[PDB]
Amino acid sequence: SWIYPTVILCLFGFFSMMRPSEPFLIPYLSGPDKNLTSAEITNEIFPVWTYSYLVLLLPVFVLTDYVRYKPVIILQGISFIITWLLLLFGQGVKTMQVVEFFYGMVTAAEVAYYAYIYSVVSPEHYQRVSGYCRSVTLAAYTAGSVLAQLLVSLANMSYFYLNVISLASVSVAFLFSLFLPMPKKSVFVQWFQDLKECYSSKRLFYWSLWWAFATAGFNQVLNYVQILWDYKAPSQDSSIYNGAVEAIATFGGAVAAFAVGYVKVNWDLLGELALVVFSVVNAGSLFLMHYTANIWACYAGYLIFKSSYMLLITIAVFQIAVNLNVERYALVFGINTFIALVIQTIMTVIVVDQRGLNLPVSIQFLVYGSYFAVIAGIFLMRSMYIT
């Protein structure tokens, strides 16, 4: 039944997302072993990841369903070993840009990871599958965070050995991906025409429209929430307080994802209400993070925002999967992720980049909260127009 593929994919998504080095990527790169500078990391290394993410997302949503979702997962696994093997023993900006290219490949094939299990289980399980899988990834993340924060604070473990542990983790995920059950088989304009058949499904464009826009803002908030926390209360100890808080925010999000899979509720007649309510919650949390000048209130707002968004995206992925009525699960997921990345890149250029308005982190989260309020109101107004 659904138990074996779900268990194997959950193990893969745990041991692949359980990375102790992820919280300490910036200190590792600009440290005594990697020996880089923040100018080179932010300007010459990090944008390579976004460029590679877009470029390698293109074939992910073009070719994942045709190859039956397994080689792209195995490609993600192999890119996981390559990324961390180069990150362990790579020097200078030239090798770190290759690391970012392979991490872009990894994040692009995450779409295949998400769509594979929908390609393997029957639709009646799509809800449970939607929660568990997503949940475990978030669980992995918080586990990794703890596995970092404990070790660096209790075992005096260096960041290099954190990356060694991360490589050991993602190599186990590669072995688990090797044992995934293989899904069963089955001009330019024609492809687009098929896309027209794929996005004509019921409530799929609306859920995809939320996915394309909400997750761009979610990624922006994830990027700049640490900056907002540092601005709200500048402390040297915040390194041990910020990431730990994120671990609580991720775990809560994990719980929210587990709420979708476990709790049996008809999401067809409750999808719009959940979307509007939890988008209002997202906007209210984001406004709470900025407007209130309390670090604990901002922490609670971020926890609520991440939890609400993870619950909503679990619902979105589930509802897109069941209503798709075509086998092209990764085409829709990949296109949603690509549009989300394009929107996030445009918003990053506009609101925070020096080439744009260069808004400080104080006004940045007011902008993000208003962005999510616009999303909520557009979906709130649509419900009123329907009724």
Ligand X SMILES: Cc1ncc(C[n+]2csc(CCO)c2C)c(N)n1
User: How far, CA to CA in Å, does 386 sit from each of 228, 269, 383?
Assistant: 38, 13, 5
Please, what is the minimum distance in Å from the beta carbon of residue 12 to ligand X?
A: 18
Total residues contacting ligand X by CB under 6 A comes to 6
Q: Which residue is nearest to ligand X (CB)?
A: 49
The reply to whether 371 sits near ligand X by the rule CB under 6 A is: no
Please, what is the minimum distance in Å from the beta carbon of residue 87 to ligand X?
A: 7
Binding mask 166-205 for ligand X (x = CB under 6 A): ----------------------------------------
By beta-carbon proximity to ligand X, the closer residue of 100 and 327 is 100
Please, what is the minimum distance in Å from the beta carbon of residue 324 to ligand X?
A: 29
The reply to whether 223 sits near ligand X by the rule CB under 6 A is: yes
Please, what is the minimum distance in Å from the beta carbon of residue 36 to ligand X?
A: 13
Inter-residue contact 368 to 218 (CB < 8 Å): no
By beta-carbon proximity to ligand X, the closer residue of 310 and 352 is 352
Kindly tell me which residue out of 2, 30, 46, 233 binds ligand X, with binding defined by CB under 6 A: 46
Please, what is the minimum distance in Å from the beta carbon of residue 96 to ligand X?
A: 9
The reply to whether 246 sits near ligand X by the rule CB under 6 A is: no
CB atoms within 10 A of CB 360: 11
By beta-carbon proximity to ligand X, the closer residue of 228 and 322 is 228
Binding mask 56-95 for ligand X (x = CB under 6 A): ----------------------------------------
SS3 labels along the chain: CCHHHHHHHHHHHHHHHCCCCCCCHHHHHCCCCCCCCHHHHHHHHHHHHHHHHHHHHHHHHHHCCCCCCHHHHHHHHHHHHHHHHHHHCCCHHHHHHHHHHHHHHHHHHHHHHHHHHHCCCCHHHHHHHHHHHHHHHHHHHHHHHHHHHHHHHHCCCCHHHHHHHHHHHHHHHHHHHHCCCCCCCCCHHHHHHHHHHHCCCCCHHHHHHHHHHHHHHHHHHHHHHHHHHHHHCCCCCHHHHHHHHHHHHHHHHHHHHHHHHHCCCCCCCCHHHHHHHHHHHHHHHHHHHHHCCCHHHHHHHHHHHHHHHHHHHHHHHHHHHHHCCCCCHHHHHHHHHHHHHHHHHHHHHHHCCCCCCCCCHHHHHHHHHHHHHHHHHHHHHHHHHHC
Please, what is the minimum distance in Å from the beta carbon of residue 17 to ligand X?
A: 12
Residues 311, 308: Cα–Cα separation, whole Å: 5
Please, what is the minimum distance in Å from the beta carbon of residue 84 to ligand X?
A: 8
The reply to whether 25 sits near ligand X by the rule CB under 6 A is: yes
Kindly tell me which residue out of 103, 116, 210, 333 binds ligand X, with binding defined by CB under 6 A: 103
The reply to whether 231 sits near ligand X by the rule CB under 6 A is: no
By beta-carbon proximity to ligand X, the closer residue of 17 and 129 is 17
Kindly tell me which residue out of 12, 24, 49, 379 binds ligand X, with binding defined by CB under 6 A: 49
Please, what is the minimum distance in Å from the beta carbon of residue 271 to ligand X?
A: 31
By beta-carbon proximity to ligand X, the closer residue of 46 and 205 is 46
Please, what is the minimum distance in Å from the beta carbon of residue 57 to ligand X?
A: 15
By beta-carbon proximity to ligand X, the closer residue of 114 and 206 is 114
By beta-carbon proximity to ligand X, the closer residue of 96 and 313 is 96
The reply to whether 100 sits near ligand X by the rule CB under 6 A is: yes
Inter-residue contact 198 to 326 (CB < 8 Å): yes
**Interacting residue ranges for ligand X, rule: CB under 6 A:** 25, 46, 49, 100, 103, 223
